[PDB]
Design a protein around this ligand. Structure first.
Ligand code: PNS
Ligand code: MG
Lengths: 115, 79, 111, 217, 69
């Protein structure tokens, strides 16, 4: 569950993420009917006064069993057309991105590791 | 094999390569000061040797050729 | 069957502009074959996408799942995943900036 | 003798025949896959098939930090940090896509549940992925590793200081004040250790279960 | 400043010997990509980074993290 207003730990090699800023990046909108995002949903995100679409890669509330659970809300940036801003992703990414319907093939070419 | 075949095929693939300037393609045609090449470009020339006229060239001997007289002679007694 | 040989047939038969594949080893549990291929433009990459899903769909493998083309709206990138392999139709500039050929050979040994 | 916790039922007014059935299936899985003895401190590595990769398997290593669940659906969740990121997985012990569960380092910690490791220093939770399984000797009790860990600052996951948790693997002296300690001794419940109607005696349960184990052999 | 002298050109020519054993792909874009891995990188660097990039050259040679076909 990553709802509105949640602080977000961006995992990218992006300019927006690794730039220091006085506000933590936090979610604004979740692109589901209910406002609750799971692993593999798109959200709007406020980074440096710039709203930006983003993709949820692992959260802290438990999901199904054999899937992993992170100790932060790891999120990968993405552009409007759908290609990601980032170039490398250091923290491990669950393979549960593969089955879901949406843009996931682009992100799974970037991961250093897989959990 | 014709020895002049070795001569004009070493000379020939030296003409086939594109980055070099065919200005002083002698038998003492050197790479780093005659034609101004890096050692990466030198093994790129070795790559430009083994492709048509070669295939048995050892790396310890391809490191130190540096002139096509030594190349024609070395493939000459190599065969 | 629809193997990587058949993929080489589909892409050289299309005359794809640039080809570079990586055999992903079985531990890194994403895929087996990782195809990186570029083309002329959005029309070219788009049309050869619909061509290769046309030939896989028409070819064989009914029980195997139907495959969705990803990123139909974006211009530079396009990507399609199968059981064994995943093809990335993109631009060589996009290839220059995302440097995928380095990544799937250097999993921790790059930037 | 070590009887793994998934065979002991929680008390309740369910029928013993249902656990006869469950234990039958659990032993029929334990023919195929070898389920080893492991405690809630031990370092494990589990190989699983992937539903997303075509018949490729994977290995996760970590600390078993909880052994919850009874019966066929019983789990254990193991933890590790990699790439400066903490990850945990709930593994179902009898999910047939697990292939081997190797015990790297069989050891028992001071507690029965190490969920406080989420708030410890990340050095207390990191492990080598390719670490070698340490050899234990056949005829010996287990090494009870005690390690009072060090805690990160105060806003924890839960108030581990409270005596309903009965946490033993904390160096509280480094990371808590005496005033907040004496405040935490308010929620003591000293009587609770002394009532004899809350004590669930699994002794005859253990007997019938060990005849279930021997009879399946 | 690299790991040694002979090792760099040895791994270079070894990658080219795999470059002819390449089977399915456009081998000239491959060779030009070997260039751009080696030309614009191996010119004017500090002696520590030489070690690390020849180690990623080692791993790129061995191909236990995947191999180009
Ligand atoms: C060592 C040498 C001077 C040899 O070339 P040659 O002209 O002697 C040249 O090939 C070189 O500078 N290589 C550096 C290798 C290296 O460090 N590669 C990684 C780049 S950080
Ligand atoms: Mg909480």
């Amino acid at each position: 569950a990553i709802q509105k207003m949640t602080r977000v730990r961006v995992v990218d090699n992006s300019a927006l993420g690794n730039s220091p800023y006085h506000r933590a990046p936090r979610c604004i909108h979740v692109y589901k009917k209910n406002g609750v995002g799971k692993v593999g949903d798109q959200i709007l995100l406020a980074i440096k006064g710039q709203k930006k679409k983003a993709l949820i890669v692992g959260h802290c509330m438990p999901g199904p069993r054999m899937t992993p659970r992170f100790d932060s809300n790891n999120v990968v940036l993405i552009e409007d057309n759908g290609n990601p801003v980032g170039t490398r992703i250091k923290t491990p990414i669950p393979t549960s991105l593969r089955k879901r319907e949406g843009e996931y093939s682009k992100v799974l070419a970037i991961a250093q590791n897989f959990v | 094999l014709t020895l002049e075949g070795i001569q004009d095929r070493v000379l020939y693939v030296l003409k086939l390569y594109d980055k070099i300037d065919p200005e002083k393609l002698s038998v003492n045609s050197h790479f780093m000061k005659d034609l101004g090449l890096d050692s990466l470009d030198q093994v790129e020339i070795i790559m430009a040797m083994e492709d048509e006229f070669g295939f048995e060239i050892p790396d310890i001997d391809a490191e130190k050729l540096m002139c096509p007289q030594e190349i024609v002679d070395y493939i000459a007694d190599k065969k | 069957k629809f193997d990587i040989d058949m993929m080489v047939s589909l892409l050289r038969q299309e005359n794809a502009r640039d080809i570079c594949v990586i055999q992903v080893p079985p531990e890194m549990r994403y895929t087996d074959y990782f195809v990186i291929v570029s083309g002329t433009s959005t029309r070219h990459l788009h049309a050869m996408a619909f061509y290769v899903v046309k030939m896989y769909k028409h070819l064989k493998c009914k029980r195997d799942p139907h495959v969705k083309i990803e990123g139909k709206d974006t211009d530079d990138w396009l990507c399609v995943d199968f059981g064994s392999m995943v093809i990335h139709l993109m631009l060589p500039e996009t290839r220059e900036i995302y440097e995928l050929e380095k990544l799937w050979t250097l999993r921790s040994y790059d930037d | 003798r070590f009887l793994s916790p998934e065979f002991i039922p929680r008390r309740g007014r369910t029928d013993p025949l249902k656990f006869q059935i469950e234990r039958k299936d659990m032993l029929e899985r334990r023919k195929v896959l070898h389920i080893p003895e492991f405690y809630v401190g031990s370092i494990l590595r589990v190989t699983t098939a992937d539903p997303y990769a075509s018949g490729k398997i994977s290995q996760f290593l970590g600390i078993c930090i909880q052994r919850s669940g009874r019966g066929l659906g019983a789990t254990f969740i193991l933890r590790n940090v990699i790439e400066g990121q903490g990850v945990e997985i709930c593994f179902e012990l009898y999910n047939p896509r697990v292939q081997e569960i190797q015990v790297v380092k069989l050891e028992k910690r001071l507690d029965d549940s190490l969920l406080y490791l989420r708030d410890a220093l990340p050095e207390y939770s990191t492990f080598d992925v390719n670490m070698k399984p340490v050899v234990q000797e056949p005829n010996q009790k287990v090494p009870v590793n005690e390690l009072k860990v060090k805690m990160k600052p105060k806003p924890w996951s839960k108030r581990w200081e409270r005596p309903n948790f009965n946490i033993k693997g904390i160096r509280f002296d480094l990371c808590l004040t005496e005033q907040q300690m004496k405040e935490a001794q308010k929620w003591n419940q000293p009587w609770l250790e002394f009532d004899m109607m809350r004590e669930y005696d699994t002794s005859k349960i253990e007997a019938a279960i060990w005849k279930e184990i021997e009879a399946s052999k | 400043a690299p790991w040694s002298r002979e090792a760099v050109l040895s791994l270079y020519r070894a990658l080219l010997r795999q470059g002819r054993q390449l089977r399915y792909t456009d081998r000239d874009f491959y060779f030009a990509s070997i260039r751009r891995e080696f030309r614009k990188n191996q010119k004017l660097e500090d002696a520590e980074a030489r070690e690390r990039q020849l180690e990623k050259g080692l791993v790129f040679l061995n191909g236990k993290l995947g191999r180009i076909i």
